[PDB]
Symmetry: C2
Subunit: 48 residues, 2 copies
């Protein structure tokens, strides 16, 4: 009873862990994405 | 003994699903950051 009650709690915290990793990483997706778009526009202007 | 089993397997799937999300999102951070140099040295020699 106890050891399967452990892996029940050993899942939910890791669920709670990686969600904070995922929610951080979607924000990390942002500051690359606008900066890549920034570069793309700058390059386009120079080429023009 | 059966109820802790069924909440266990759905949770490990949520462990299994969320690491599939992280595995997809890490290579995007590769594909974005590899594109960061890929524009930049292409913008650099077209500058000169």
């Amino acid at each position: 009873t106890q050891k399967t009650a452990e892996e029940l709690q050993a899942s939910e915290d890791k669920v709670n862990h990686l969600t904070k990793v995922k929610a951080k990483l979607e924000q990390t997706l942002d500051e690359l994405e606008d900066s890549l778009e920034r570069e793309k526009k700058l390059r386009g202007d120079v080429e023009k």
